[PDB]
């Protein structure tokens, strides 16, 4: 590349993200006073495990659909083969959502945005997967301590997705090429904005891997308990990525 082509890539990725970010950051920040009441939290904890798993599946799918559309708009993604696009989305889609989720997380009171209001981790107790919940909350807490800008999130999420190490890639070298370009774009933007201090503080790739693994493990535990629920009421896309 050259210095001009990289900056062009920076803006194009940032643009691709803005157009697919699901909810504007301002919208999430404006809603931070909107916290579930004690009565509403109890209401969430009173709901059945399966209804609650169904609801999380549906919201997860919504979020992922924006990541699909982000990838489609991401430069060079559509130039890869149909096999590789699918491989990259099966492994990285959930990881990208995980990173995006820190936008909806409030580090002051340790709450997340969920169904119109903010609630802490006790809200999710009916799911019967407290270790996963804590992990997700810890992850978002650790990301929020980085004070990510939207542009930074755009560029870091591009990289999470465009990962040339994923098993099953047919045109590996072609994916290595794109990865390196986005790496340059990210790192160039960090240099230019004096924010290279964050390179050291980004979580290891094995941390995101661990979270997604935990998700699939907890889902298989749940599916064994309620097979027909997953069969009949879970989103097809979610089933496709996760079971």
């Amino acid at each position: 590349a050259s210095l001009t082509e990289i900056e062009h890539l920076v803006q194009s990725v940032c643009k691709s993200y803005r157009e697919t970010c699901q909810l504007r950051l301002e919208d999430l920040l404006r809603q931070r006073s909107n916290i579930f009441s004690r009565e509403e939290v109890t209401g969430y904890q009173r709901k059945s495990m399966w209804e609650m798993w169904e609801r999380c599946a549906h919201h997860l799918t919504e979020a992922i659909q924006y990541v699909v559309e982000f990838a489609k708009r991401l430069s060079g993604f559509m130039e890869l083969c149909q096999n590789d696009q699918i491989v990259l989305l099966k492994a990285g889609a959930m990881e990208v959502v995980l990173v995006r989720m820190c936008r909806a997380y409030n580090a002051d009171n340790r709450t997340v945005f969920f169904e119109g209001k903010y609630g802490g981790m006790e809200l999710f107790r009916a799911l019967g997967c407290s270790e996963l919940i804590s992990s997700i909350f810890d992850f978002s807490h650790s990301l929020s301590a980085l004070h990510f800008s939207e542009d930074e999130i755009a560029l870091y999420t591009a990289l999470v997705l465009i990962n040339a190490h994923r098993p099953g890639l047919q045109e590996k070298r072609k994916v290595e090429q794109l990865q390196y370009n986005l790496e340059l774009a990210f790192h160039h933007h960090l240099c230019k904005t004096h924010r290279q201090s964050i390179l050291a503080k980004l979580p290891p790739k094995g941390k995101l891997r661990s979270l997604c693994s935990q998700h699939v493990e907890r889902l298989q535990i749940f599916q064994h308990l309620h097979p027909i629920v997953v069969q009949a009421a879970f989103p097809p896309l979610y089933k496709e990525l996760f079971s």
Binding site: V68, E69, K72, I86, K90, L237, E240
Partner: peptide, 8 residues
Amino acid sequence: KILHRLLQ
């Protein structure tokens, strides 16, 4: 299945 449809 669904991924293919979303990408086309």
